[PDB]
């Protein structure tokens, strides 16, 4: 669909290459990052790599389904991390771009 094309060619394109994107390009690895409570707190992990694969593989049935996955990724970050953690500011920066681009997405 045209909305999913826009989410891939415009939204994901902008977010994937952003200088703050690197912590979000793959699933949170609780072992690598030393976060033994991560999966106790966050029950629906999400990341941009997964979203990008789903767009590439025509996994989504609706634009809002992809938008919900972006939202879950950012919301997980705000719920799990401390308010003062730098990753929170990175997520906020990327979410602002997501919303600005989504404001001009096609309607169908």
């Amino acid at each position: 669909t045209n909305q999913l094309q826009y989410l891939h060619k415009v939204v994901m394109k902008a977010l994937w290459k952003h200088q703050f994107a690197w912590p979000f390009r793959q699933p949170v690895d609780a072992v690598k990052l030393g976060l033994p409570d991560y999966h106790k707190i966050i029950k629906q992990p999400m990341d941009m790599g997964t979203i990008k694969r789903r767009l590439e593989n025509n996994y989504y049935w609706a634009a809002s389904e992809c938008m919900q996955d972006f939202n879950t990724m950012f919301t997980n970050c705000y719920i799990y991390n401390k308010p003062t953690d730098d990753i929170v500011l990175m997520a906020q920066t990327l979410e602002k771009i997501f919303l600005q681009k989504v404001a001009s997405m096609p309607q169908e």
């Binding site: 976060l35 409570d37 707190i41 799990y80 991390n81 730098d86 990753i87």
Partner: peptide
């Protein structure tokens, strides 16, 4: 409330 990434 999580340990957090720093």
């Amino acid at each position: 409330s999580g340990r957090g990434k720093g």
